[PDB]
Curated annotation (Swiss-Prot):
PANTHER family: PHOSPHOGLUCOMUTASE-1 (PTHR22573:SF37), PHOSPHOHEXOMUTASE FAMILY MEMBER (PTHR22573). One of its GO terms (molecular function) is magnesium ion binding. Pfam families: PGM1_C_vert_fung (PF24947), PGM_PMM_I (PF02878), PGM_PMM_II (PF02879), PGM_PMM_III (PF02880). Its cofactor is Mg(2+). It comes from Oryctolagus cuniculus (Rabbit). This is Phosphoglucomutase-1.
Amino acid sequence: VKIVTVKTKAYPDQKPGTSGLRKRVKVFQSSTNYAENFIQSIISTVEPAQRQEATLVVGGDGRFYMKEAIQLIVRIAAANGIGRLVIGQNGILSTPAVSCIIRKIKAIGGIILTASHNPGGPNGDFGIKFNISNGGPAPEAITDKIFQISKTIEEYAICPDLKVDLGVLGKQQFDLENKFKPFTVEIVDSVEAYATMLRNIFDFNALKELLSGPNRLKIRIDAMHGVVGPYVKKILCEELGAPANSAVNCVPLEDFGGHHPDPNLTYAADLVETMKSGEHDFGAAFDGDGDRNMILGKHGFFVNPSDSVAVIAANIFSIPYFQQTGVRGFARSMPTSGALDRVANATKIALYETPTGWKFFGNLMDASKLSLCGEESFGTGSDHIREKDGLWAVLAWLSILATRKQSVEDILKDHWHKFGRNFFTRYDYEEVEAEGATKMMKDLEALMFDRSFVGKQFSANDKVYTVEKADNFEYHDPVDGSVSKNQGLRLIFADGSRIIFRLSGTGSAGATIRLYIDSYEKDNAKINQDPQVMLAPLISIALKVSQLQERTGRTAPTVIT
Ligand SMILES: [Mg+2]
């Protein structure tokens, strides 16, 4: 084919976030050269001389416009000199499978066409994310470079006649006019490299015993019509042997079957209705692109994500990878509960508390100081790759059930009985007016910084909470040097309980207040109650010291997780 140079005009808004460039599907398809300038801007960050020998992994979550943005990447990458692109079959590759493949073949990076748990279809959202050579998300320095280039871009190169069959396994080669080396595109089974990686991490003979035997464990895995559907069928049913009705919504749909692929009790209510019946021993759900997960035990028992990372941490040697690797360190984002800290202190393993986001975890994993990490927002991972991994957390739970031979609920009651329970909840106030919400944060922080706040006591039934430390979290990264400030207000009490306030949506008309309550209970009489009843005293203290109702007019949160 011929390489053609197209003059373009730059856009002002293409600034990739930590999740790449997320925008409504109609913007990508209706704004002339929007996608073409973003893709050309990504490729321009690879020095022209390093491109011929380079390989780019390209894949997405199955959503609408994914096939159409992949043919565009092929046309621009070809005309720009990239030697090879490895693409998942039919365009499908979960975010953990793109991280696995970059690292495995030493790819220069990958482009993931996913807008994560967001909606797909003619009316949804579309996202373009760039991962770099360590298989993890591109850092600020690199997304910045892409931003600069996209705003000052005058031209892009494209082969307009190049079309690739994505449904075909194998190598496709194309000659580019007068050029001396051909462009190569390798289509790859979506699941194979990722399942061979997992076959080496976990013990598949113990898992085959656990799922296909006489006395097998009964499981129900909901992939929410997202990308993990093919991984669940090929690894769990076909290789490990679970019955085919163990896999639900396992066919990727372009609109995720009209629902949001977001793993929590109400977005995945279907799977919770199935669990209520008492039939299965274990249940799980995944987000759109496979890096997040929800765990459920028998009868619908919810395993909180902050408790899920502490159970794998307390039972990590039951997984072969960690027996061979050793545990290098534990980590949680700041707002996640203190359950993991209890296990790290009991076990004597370093615990790192970071701002939310993957970057702080990548840094520590690349420094060989982090083996397992978690986030309260259904996120769990290990250093096997440099993205979170939803199915990996399900196989780490199944390995703990195989080894322990007890139900999900008995593992948790047993954990709470050894370490104490960190009752935890996350309150979201969603379109708060921004002046009221900022004033609420500014006033609570002026109050918190008074020289006599530490020492202050609060009560709201039996227990008294004594303020031990109070601050606006700041993190100084030991690896890339960065200093992150203004990450959230914390009232840390001497008993191990904490109240955290973050204004995530800081500015648009609308703002989002996320309030996190973490209440430590060691009394073996209190550890088994409903968390909303046990957290009610500390939630009252939080609304009252913050004057949130007064500041926002809200009498209740939008969502309680
Ligand atoms: Mg995701």
